[PDB]
Amino acid sequence: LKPPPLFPDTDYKPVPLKTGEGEEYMLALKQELRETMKRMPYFIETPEERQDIERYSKRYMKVYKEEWIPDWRRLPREMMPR
Amino acid sequence: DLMTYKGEVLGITRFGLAKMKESVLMLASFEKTADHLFDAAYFGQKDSVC
Amino acid sequence: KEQFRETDVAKKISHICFGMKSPEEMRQQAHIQVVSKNLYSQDNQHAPLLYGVLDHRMGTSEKDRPCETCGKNLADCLGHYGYIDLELPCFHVGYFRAVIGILQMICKTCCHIMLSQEEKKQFLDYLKRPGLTYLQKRGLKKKISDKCRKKNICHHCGAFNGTVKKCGLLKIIHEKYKTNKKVVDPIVSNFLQSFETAIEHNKEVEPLLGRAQENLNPLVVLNLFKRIPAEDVPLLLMNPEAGKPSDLILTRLLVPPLCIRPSVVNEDDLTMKLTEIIFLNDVIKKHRISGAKTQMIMEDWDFLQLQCALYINSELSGIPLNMAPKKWTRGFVQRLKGK
Amino acid sequence: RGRCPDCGSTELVEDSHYSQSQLVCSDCGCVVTEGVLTTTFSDEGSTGENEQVSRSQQRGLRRVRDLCRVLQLPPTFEDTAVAYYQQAYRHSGIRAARLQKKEVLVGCCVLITCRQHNWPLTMGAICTLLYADLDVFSSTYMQIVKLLGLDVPSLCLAELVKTYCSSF
Amino acid sequence: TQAEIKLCSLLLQEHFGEIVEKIGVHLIRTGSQPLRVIAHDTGTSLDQVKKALCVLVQHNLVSYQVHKRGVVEYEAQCSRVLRMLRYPRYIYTTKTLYSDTGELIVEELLLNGKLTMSAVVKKVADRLTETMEDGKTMDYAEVSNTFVRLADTHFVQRCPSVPTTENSDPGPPPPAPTLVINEKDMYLVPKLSLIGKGKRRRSSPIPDDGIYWQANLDRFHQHFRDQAIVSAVANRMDQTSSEIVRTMLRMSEITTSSSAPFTQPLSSNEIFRSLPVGYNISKQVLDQYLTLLADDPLEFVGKSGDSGGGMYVINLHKALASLATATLESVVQERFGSRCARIFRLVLQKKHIEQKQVEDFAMIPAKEAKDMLYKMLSENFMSLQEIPKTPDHAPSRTFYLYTVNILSAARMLLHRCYKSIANLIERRQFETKENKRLLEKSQRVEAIIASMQATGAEEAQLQEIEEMITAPERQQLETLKRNVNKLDASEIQVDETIFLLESYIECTMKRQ
Amino acid sequence: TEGRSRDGGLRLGEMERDCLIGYGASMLLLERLMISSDAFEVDVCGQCGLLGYSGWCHYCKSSCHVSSLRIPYACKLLFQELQSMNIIPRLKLSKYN
Amino acid sequence: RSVTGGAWYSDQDFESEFVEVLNQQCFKFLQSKAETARESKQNPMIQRNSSFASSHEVWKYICELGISKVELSMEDIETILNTLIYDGKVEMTIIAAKEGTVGSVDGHMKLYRAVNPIIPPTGLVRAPCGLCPVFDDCHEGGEISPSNCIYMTEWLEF
Numbered sequence A: 001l002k003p004p005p006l007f008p009d010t011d012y013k014p015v016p017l018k019t020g021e022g023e024e025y026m027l028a029l030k031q032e033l034r035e036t037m038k039r040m041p042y043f044i045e046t047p048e049e050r051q052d053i054e055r056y057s058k059r060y061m062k063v064y065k066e067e068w069i070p071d072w073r074r075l076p077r078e079m080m081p082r
Numbered sequence B: 001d002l003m004t005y006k007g008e009v010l011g012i013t014r015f016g017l018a019k020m021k022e023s024v025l026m027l028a029s030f031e032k033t034a035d036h037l038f039d040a041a042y043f044g045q046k047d048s049v050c
Numbered sequence C: 001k002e003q004f005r006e007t008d009v010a011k012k013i014s015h016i017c018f019g020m021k022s023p024e025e026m027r028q029q030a031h032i033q034v035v036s037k038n039l040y041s042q043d044n045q046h047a048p049l050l051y052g053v054l055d056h057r058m059g060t061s062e063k064d065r066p067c068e069t070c071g072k073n074l075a076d077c078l079g080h081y082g083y084i085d086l087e088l089p090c091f092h093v094g095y096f097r098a099v100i101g102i103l104q105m106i107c108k109t110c111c112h113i114m115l116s117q118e119e120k121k122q123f124l125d126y127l128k129r130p131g132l133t134y135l136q137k138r139g140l141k142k143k144i145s146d147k148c149r150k151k152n153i154c155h156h157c158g159a160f161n162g163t164v165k166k167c168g169l170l171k172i173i174h175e176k177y178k179t180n181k182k183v184v185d186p187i188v189s190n191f192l193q194s195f196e197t198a199i200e201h202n203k204e205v206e207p208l209l210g211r212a213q214e215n216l217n218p219l220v221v222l223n224l225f226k227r228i229p230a231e232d233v234p235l236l237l238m239n240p241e242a243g244k245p246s247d248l249i250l251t252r253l254l255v256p257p258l259c260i261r262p263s264v265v266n267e268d269d270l271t272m273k274l275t276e277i278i279f280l281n282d283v284i285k286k287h288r289i290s291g292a293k294t295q296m297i298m299e300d301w302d303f304l305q306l307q308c309a310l311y312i313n314s315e316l317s318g319i320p321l322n323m324a325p326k327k328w329t330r331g332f333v334q335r336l337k338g339k
Numbered sequence D: 001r002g003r004c005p006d007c008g009s010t011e012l013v014e015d016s017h018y019s020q021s022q023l024v025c026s027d028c029g030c031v032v033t034e035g036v037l038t039t040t041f042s043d044e045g046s047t048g049e050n051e052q053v054s055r056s057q058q059r060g061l062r063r064v065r066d067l068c069r070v071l072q073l074p075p076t077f078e079d080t081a082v083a084y085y086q087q088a089y090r091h092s093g094i095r096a097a098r099l100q101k102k103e104v105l106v107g108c109c110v111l112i113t114c115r116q117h118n119w120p121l122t123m124g125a126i127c128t129l130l131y132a133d134l135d136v137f138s139s140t141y142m143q144i145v146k147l148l149g150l151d152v153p154s155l156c157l158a159e160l161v162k163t164y165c166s167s168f
Numbered sequence E: 001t002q003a004e005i006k007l008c009s010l011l012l013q014e015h016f017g018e019i020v021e022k023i024g025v026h027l028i029r030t031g032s033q034p035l036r037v038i039a040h041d042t043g044t045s046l047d048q049v050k051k052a053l054c055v056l057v058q059h060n061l062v063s064y065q066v067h068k069r070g071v072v073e074y075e076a077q078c079s080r081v082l083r084m085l086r087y088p089r090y091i092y093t094t095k096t097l098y099s100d101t102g103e104l105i106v107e108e109l110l111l112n113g114k115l116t117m118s119a120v121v122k123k124v125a126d127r128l129t130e131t132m133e134d135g136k137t138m139d140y141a142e143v144s145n146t147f148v149r150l151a152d153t154h155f156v157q158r159c160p161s162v163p164t165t166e167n168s169d170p171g172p173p174p175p176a177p178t179l180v181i182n183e184k185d186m187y188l189v190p191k192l193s194l195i196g197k198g199k200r201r202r203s204s205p206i207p208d209d210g211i212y213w214q215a216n217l218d219r220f221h222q223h224f225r226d227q228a229i230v231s232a233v234a235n236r237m238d239q240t241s242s243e244i245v246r247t248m249l250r251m252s253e254i255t256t257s258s259s260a261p262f263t264q265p266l267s268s269n270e271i272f273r274s275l276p277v278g279y280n281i282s283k284q285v286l287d288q289y290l291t292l293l294a295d296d297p298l299e300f301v302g303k304s305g306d307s308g309g310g311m312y313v314i315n316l317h318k319a320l321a322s323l324a325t326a327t328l329e330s331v332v333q334e335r336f337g338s339r340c341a342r343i344f345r346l347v348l349q350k351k352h353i354e355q356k357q358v359e360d361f362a363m364i365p366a367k368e369a370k371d372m373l374y375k376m377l378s379e380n381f382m383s384l385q386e387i388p389k390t391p392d393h394a395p396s397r398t399f400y401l402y403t404v405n406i407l408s409a410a411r412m413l414l415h416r417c418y419k420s421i422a423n424l425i426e427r428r429q430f431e432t433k434e435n436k437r438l439l440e441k442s443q444r445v446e447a448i449i450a451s452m453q454a455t456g457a458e459e460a461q462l463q464e465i466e467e468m469i470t471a472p473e474r475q476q477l478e479t480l481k482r483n484v485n486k487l488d489a490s491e492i493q494v495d496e497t498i499f500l501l502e503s504y505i506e507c508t509m510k511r512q
Numbered sequence F: 001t002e003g004r005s006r007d008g009g010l011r012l013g014e015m016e017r018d019c020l021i022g023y024g025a026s027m028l029l030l031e032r033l034m035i036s037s038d039a040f041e042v043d044v045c046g047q048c049g050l051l052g053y054s055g056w057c058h059y060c061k062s063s064c065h066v067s068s069l070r071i072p073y074a075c076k077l078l079f080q081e082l083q084s085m086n087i088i089p090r091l092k093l094s095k096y097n
Numbered sequence G: 001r002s003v004t005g006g007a008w009y010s011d012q013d014f015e016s017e018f019v020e021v022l023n024q025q026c027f028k029f030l031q032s033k034a035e036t037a038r039e040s041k042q043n044p045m046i047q048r049n050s051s052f053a054s055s056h057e058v059w060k061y062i063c064e065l066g067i068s069k070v071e072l073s074m075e076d077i078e079t080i081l082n083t084l085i086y087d088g089k090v091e092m093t094i095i096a097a098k099e100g101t102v103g104s105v106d107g108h109m110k111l112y113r114a115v116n117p118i119i120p121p122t123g124l125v126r127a128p129c130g131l132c133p134v135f136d137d138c139h140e141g142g143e144i145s146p147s148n149c150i151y152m153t154e155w156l157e158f
């Protein structure tokens, strides 16, 4: 008659975590590194675009970037970074 | 000429028709309907209204 | 103040695109589930059940009320859908040829198709070929199935395969570990040892174990298709975006709108035909708390499979005379059939 | 619709010149100025929902049907007596009573049924079949009638002579 | 292979952004192609595709190759893409075997994709100098000591080198240099001209030009299973067996292939001398221990002879089989109960059997045992042989013997594991995203506190910046952090099962 | 409906749909077969390619993709018919020009 | 026997309590023997024997305890222990018949010993989707999602 609930109950419940220090350090180093390495220019976010109007503020707090330097002797011809 | 434009004599038969037309509904309308329908769904055929 | 509204856009159909739906897609489409074998209240009013078929939340079949979903009367209600779920998987009949083709084409141990990298290159090139046609797809199906069926070993995993054979209508088997005309490999000793306890407790197996075969069933087959390499998908000529090999097997059905099957006299073909399916499903459900033996279990499963097969069409041939079709029935195929 | 083009119509009735379906309305001697095309059936080819019923109860039903088919009388007597049997099979004492009382019950129901349709019959003809005894079935009859409070005619004097005299 | 794609895609987005990830996913779903058709499929500009593929080559998730008619394509690496979550364990391993220096080394190796020894040693030294004050510095000598130790142990190694393209195929060059590799110098270090110490940097000539190197992960993988077997034997009999197995394997490291089912036998004479002096076991007691171990019916190690002293051999494949069976036993046990483990172990030993033959052995009565067995079919752990008695094959005339297969079980279990991992990670990401308002507010107030924290400090900003609704909400963020910690721990506490499972599955293939 | 016994008008079998093409008339055929007989209007969602109702797509849970088409009612019946068999005729919509 | 059902088949019901207490107490005794034997801690080669209990020994112990008022039998107890191997708790060993009063095998006699599990509980069982009964349907696009699964979240709390 009445279809069951979306989540039927469970007799068992998951085993609790085991405590471990060097692992917890690693746990910390995981959350540190995932936020750290995103700086590496291998990571890419969108290029800057769609500015309102030229205001000399853009000259003063301008963003700086210089083109990346891969190994030009290992990849196919078109590898030039531009 | 119609029977031979494909480089082979294709008679007016359920077999010739399959070898001659491509759209789905006119196959499904003529004969071997369910077979054509299921095979078409299998292939994921698009079909234009042409 | 008001935001601009596009009132309408003159539009026209471009293409139809035929394809399959997954169990999860089927859930997402549905408005409600239906979980009852009965249809009317036992009272004098003959009112429909809420969670049984003919739920007016799914649509309308009368002149005196809207459906509880769209909220308007029969003159305009397009219709809606509900869905049901089986206890055990069952083949679709319509795609049964597809299932046997796929089981034939793939290596059982590792799910890959037994192709040479040269063959892979050739056929992916043909795939790249512009202007691919239906007929051409038939051609490639034929040629690749030919160059695969002649294989016995698998390059990938490092093992050989039997062959697929029917074991009666709606059922299928594979010839892996039978005794082989080329004489059995030493693994026959392992087969024999695996039967040791059964032989000791039941010697009547010994005359039989030499005739063993891969007793693949719908459940394991579905399980197998869950693990097909994505790279290997399109070479089955399936468009991966239209339908994926998981959906060739089913575990749920849509209950189509009432206006598809108006029931006034006050029965209809689809209506009670599907009542059969839901009743037998509840029967096997009760059986799941029964303490019963094995025979009736797999028998009830195959009964569900038979019932679905009927629910699609009616001219099925190979049924033994003990549960043959009881009368003519207009399944979907039969209402598209004929003048 | 409902209204005529603007004013006070609210009713709808059908009329049509020729093979059509238009909705008469009656504030204007009009058709709600709208009509709609009736949709209908046919050119193809009262409930189910049948309770499985207690085994002994349906045994009783089988006795009921087999009984009044002795009289080879209109099936409606069968159906209404069966309905009365279902109406009666709703009480603990009736359920707990020995089966002989149930057997005489399947006869008293037909008795009252025939009386409602003033179909001639007499106690002896019925009781010759049920292994019944005067005290048993008479007491059961009084119990059922006073339990259910049902009205029922009496044996009209001239009612029985017609069939009785024809038996000579 | 969906969950594979889901996991790898979300990880790739995590570590390289939602711009290259689409290229990566399409690549793994297409294998290899030239940039032309790739850009066509993605509908993406040439420059974007290039600035992705260059990175995917730097970390070698994709290769490149010149193909028939000279067309280059870039080949996806289906395992590389997903090894990454194992990096934690590599870092732990290096810091365990070695000091923090090895860990600072490896963290670089993977972060940059590749480096030349001059580059990596200089970079690590400079950042090392950041870790201490007072002009203290560390020389290149110690860094090179760790480096050569690692290379000798083959935990790190050289990249594939360019061929002699400067003096071959004169005229128009090939579209790509088609790098090559060789084992001859595969762990041979270069003599650098850079000398001295790390130097602190202004933040605003190469002798080892082109000599790049990368870690050898499989070396860790070999080491992981070594840990596994030694831990198993230590659990079962005693740590002394741990030491003797450790001795046998640390000599066997080079005596057999990394994936052979067995090793060549060492003599107990060699073991008796290779064992640590800290162990006082006598030769006769050592040999008697070895006889006991070879006598274990679990037979992880066998005798195989007696030439030149007691011969003994490790049987890796069976060991992996033992632990695979054990882990699957444990998962079924916890997921469904011990009784399940009992019935399972019956069917495992009694390879074919029927229900009416086990209830006595299982001692559980009817109307609970039979359905108990049946439901296991739903998850494919269980199989049934259904041998027919006749050419009729009717159900009334067949025997319903149960059956198992460990391979199918590991294969199927993989999907649940991968999907569960994806669930945890995407749950964290959802929770963070819906918390982005709160995260922004917290980070803003924390930056405000960081301002005038000690330099130019004043009291009028040290009690007001947390006075608002953040007071109860800060704990909400801390509770979010606790949930993050819980599931982050589950990650490290899931994938070791995965490691053993993939080891056991991969060794199963013969790859004819 | 069927015929004179129950008010059904006339039937125009295939063999007259053939003569209409013979002459080559197009607006006559279109009128006679879908305008006059059983014209009807339906609603679809472009995004998923599925049918909907009352200006809303239940599949995508959105409003900004639905639109209304003209259609012979028999073909709407057919599109609701196939889906039961798990053969899904998805739709791609386009400009009318 | 197919009619009687032994000392465990009672009034045509099953004496789950007797068999369960038998199992647990017999394992208690067996592991007590194993721990006390290895506490001798002299030599594994002597522990190969010391750690193993005799079936008559354990039968003598259990009937001496006399928890069940009904009698306890040789093969009945031996099978009671026989469940433990599949319980993953114990090990078996066989010797000549001269052990004990019975020598319960043809020219042989057999022993029993408690065993360590080879691994602790795995990581996966700590994951709610190691446990989540709709793991299959718990999809990001499905109405069962990690954003909405309720087990998924209660696992956060405890």
Ligand code: SF4
Pocket (backbone or CB within 6 Å): E420, E423, G127, G128, G129, G130, G131, G132, G134, G135, G138, G145, G146, G147, G149, G150, G151, G152, G153
């Ligand atoms: S999201 Fe749902 S299915 Fe996934 S682990 Fe959490 S509770 Fe289980």
Ligand SMILES: [Zn+2]
Pocket (backbone or CB within 6 Å): C059, C067, C069, C070, C071, C072, C077, C078, C079, C080
């Ligand atoms: Zn509606």
Ligand SMILES: [Zn+2]
Pocket (backbone or CB within 6 Å): C107, C108, C109, C110, C111, C112, C154, C155, C156, C157, C158, C159
């Ligand atoms: Zn294979």
Ligand SMILES: [Zn+2]
Pocket (backbone or CB within 6 Å): D007, D008, D027, D028
């Ligand atoms: Zn008026």
Ligand SMILES: [Zn+2]
Pocket (backbone or CB within 6 Å): F045, F046, F047, F048, F049, F050, F057, F059, F060, F061, F065
């Ligand atoms: Zn939509």
